[PDB]
Amino acid sequence: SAVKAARYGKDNVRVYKVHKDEKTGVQTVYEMTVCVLLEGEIETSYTKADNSVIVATDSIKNTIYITAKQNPVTPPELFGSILGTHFIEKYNHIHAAHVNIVCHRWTRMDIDGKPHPHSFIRDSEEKRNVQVDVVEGKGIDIKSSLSGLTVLKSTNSQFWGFLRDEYTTLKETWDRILSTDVDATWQWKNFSGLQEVRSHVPKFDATWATAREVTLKTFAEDNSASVQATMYKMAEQILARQQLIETVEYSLPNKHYFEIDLSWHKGLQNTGKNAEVFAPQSDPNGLIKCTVGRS
Amino acid sequence: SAVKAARYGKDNVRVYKVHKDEKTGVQTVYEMTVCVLLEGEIETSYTKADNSVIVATDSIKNTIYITAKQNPVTPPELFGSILGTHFIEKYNHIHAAHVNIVCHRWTRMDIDGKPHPHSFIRDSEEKRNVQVDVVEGKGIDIKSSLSGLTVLKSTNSQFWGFLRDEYTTLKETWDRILSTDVDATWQWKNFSGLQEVRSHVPKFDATWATAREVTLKTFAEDNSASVQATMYKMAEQILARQQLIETVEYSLPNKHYFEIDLSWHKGLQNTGKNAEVFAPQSDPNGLIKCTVGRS
Amino acid sequence: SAVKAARYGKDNVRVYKVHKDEKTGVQTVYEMTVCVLLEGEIETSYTKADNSVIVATDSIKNTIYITAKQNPVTPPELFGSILGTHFIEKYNHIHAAHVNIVCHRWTRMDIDGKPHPHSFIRDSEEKRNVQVDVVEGKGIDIKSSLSGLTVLKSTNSQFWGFLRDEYTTLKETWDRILSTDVDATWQWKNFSGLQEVRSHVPKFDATWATAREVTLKTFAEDNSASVQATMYKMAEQILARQQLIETVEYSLPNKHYFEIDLSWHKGLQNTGKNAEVFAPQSDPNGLIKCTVGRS
């Protein structure tokens, strides 16, 4: 046998960092879950039980804290690159680092129409993630995204003209409920090193806000008959507003709402134009994926 | 042996309702999970295997759907009362109905700084619930609540002066993080019947908004060395602002954030006054409860 | 206002203990999640923010570990009584201690047809729990239970004879799938103190086994048209076999499996006597409860 591939590291490392302003007295908090996986000349740890090439995962957890203490944790795209570079630079035998970061929401509270200096609320289970691959000699690869974004539109969505055969029973519709969770991922053009990443810092937070805004707006305004076409319009706008992006990827898990026919009960009308009460379905669910690039 | 208590019904009944305004064309959606358990002279289903006294759980389901279609599903406190009343009025042997409703958040999307007519977002995992108890010849008991409200304050929270013995290792503190999930419940005075509940409708949504605002404010502004003291303050205000309320119950699971001593590494200062990076703890967690009533 | 009720303590405290047999060298492991809530003269901590009467929840945690170290953690009924007793006896202003324990399975591995001395496998997600209420001058109250026991019988289950009205659409059946999670609890007669509990120790593990065996046996053998009737028989046998038990309580959340009509496709027969493929339903579900006592 032979080791064709190997990674290892620490997962689920929860980190919280606070920023205090001595002047204004305002405080800002950052909470995220980090995962670091290493690659390199560690083959013997598997084949010869040689631990000498092993940087303890516990030490990888230590490095994460230490790094967050000496560096800025925002934007996550930067912090990830810093954390990733450290490993391939500090350890001669390590040649790849894979960093995953999940950012939780801690939105500043508004008390009496005013932003509180030190109170926060988790206003959503929506996440801002980044997957940064740092490979020796090959620069830095970044993949930004947002997930856990749940949306619904009560009308202005249709579905007809689809293939029909001996396996179809679905009835075409010109009005229906469209609900889904949004997983959007934008891949940045390869970066040569930390210095290049550092120089584009301003673009990160901006592009994210751009991705979020485009998604919501397009979703809300688009009177579709093809979820596929809807997400394609979403990817176009993103690619157009940010030149540094190489590809945009969407993954929309459809959430179905069934009509309930109650006519059997005193001629109760609750279908088609009279549909008012629906039964949300936990499963199954449609899944539509999409990767869009430049011509 | 003998049956001392029995209940049965349908759980996890997902429901969705949409209200359309022909005039403006603005739509509104409601989604919730309903549970209905029944009580009465049904012992024989257990003892003699007699089903004749059993109202099918599938029919309880049908009923929930029908009820929603024929009535207003908001406020929940009202809808719950109607649904519970239905069973004791339609069945001779049914003497009590216990309805549990969980309302999910579908916040209206703001596009271009203007509310969208038919697009929604799940802006939180926070819920608004109700527990209605309809008992023949004893009125309707209603318990309202809000849960899943997660907050954190980076300062202005202390803890000192607590009991100290041979089992204590916790050091006193005058500045720490305070994070928790909020579970607040207010119990209304017993209503005589559907009519009376219908007469106080406007107080349900208002009392809920009030309970929410007081919790958020008190938490944010109170600088106490006692989570206990803070929650009592919240209950006080709620009881003072709504006379129709008998008791207010709070249950706060204290989520801890530990200081990370990094001194062992090049004398890095990250404790006490220099504490910037913390480690969130998934478990365990303090749990503080409290039921406040009137003198 | 006035404090009607108050509790507080530590929750989700994970504990693991290993017992090494000094003769054979065989190791047995125990793992469980503990929760401890205290009651007593602590009102002032809420009304006057007086922390002097507060035993830190951190100390509560510490006490759990220490107690586990100096005492046997099995059976959980004993360990819960020891832990509960400690708090009311060590603190004068503490009058009640509510201990909840969840036991996780760590089944010994059989390797090559022989029990391994120190390797375990988490076979089920089924738990064994205990709730122990230790109240000063009122003895020790113990509620044992098993939960998370999932079973299914493809046949020998019926449902017909139930009530039928204008809300009924369900067809009666004489063959159907019965699946459900099992939640069984057995209340022990009130115990005077730790001394009494200790003397009845051998009865705890035994009865749990009995409850589990009866539940499984009855469910599999009973050919009934009433779940309610099946659970009652379960309760009966448990009360007959153990006199120290006062009441048995079952809570069965049904899991439905619908037939799938496939006649629209080449007249495929998949209903009634030809039903082979079914569609498991996540929700909603029927919930049947029952508390049985002695005449």
Add this chain to the structure above:
Amino acid sequence: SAVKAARYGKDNVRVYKVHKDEKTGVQTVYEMTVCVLLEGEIETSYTKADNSVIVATDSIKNTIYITAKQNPVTPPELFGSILGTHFIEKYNHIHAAHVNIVCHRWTRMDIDGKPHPHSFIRDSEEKRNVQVDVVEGKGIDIKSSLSGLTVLKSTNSQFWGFLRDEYTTLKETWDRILSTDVDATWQWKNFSGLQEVRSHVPKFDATWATAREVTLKTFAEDNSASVQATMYKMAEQILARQQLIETVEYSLPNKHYFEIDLSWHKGLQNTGKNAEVFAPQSDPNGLIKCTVGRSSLK
């Protein structure tokens, strides 16, 4: 801009099938969750909102049910093949079918020392899965695995001799607790088509049982200084017991049990040789992976 990649289908389709032996009266049940994703000339559905090329997800669901009714659902490897094949063979514009199947346990109950004819128990949250990729003109690729296998050994596990530096605080140990959730996947050699998969049907259940056995036994008996070394040995044996296997992948999440120092309480000894009470840690956790293949050395 342009469409680089595109898939779509039905996810989380729960299925239950029962087999009744009219002779013996013994019934056997099967439950699984299926996911089917399709690929092909469907770019227009994105670029020009053309649903004409779209096979409704609802119809994909119906198809799973029909296929389940007309064919065996065991072993999963076979069923996934039968299902993926159907799509590329029935739709000219559909070129690839990605089928994911999760198998839920329903173990027959033993009552009074004998197996019950129609009663089962969910004796574990452990699962048996398969990922089948049917591509037009490329054959059938199969990835079988087992997951959710949680194990723990209270001793006979060590960790010393690792790299130490200014970021290191961990102390060396010669006796510790080793617990982990096992995730094992074995890739089969490419199959030309359905007929070839059918011929090998018997190897599927046999290899699954071998992988599970090898995993448990090795975990139990190995006294290794590294989880890496222990998972390598497991892969070795599996590759050695089945020649149709090309690679074996292992993903082990080391769950930690920390010692608790109680000496601050009357000098109570609870560390090292005296350790009895441990604190299980929910997070974070170590994560070790590795893909083992066949050597080129003769």
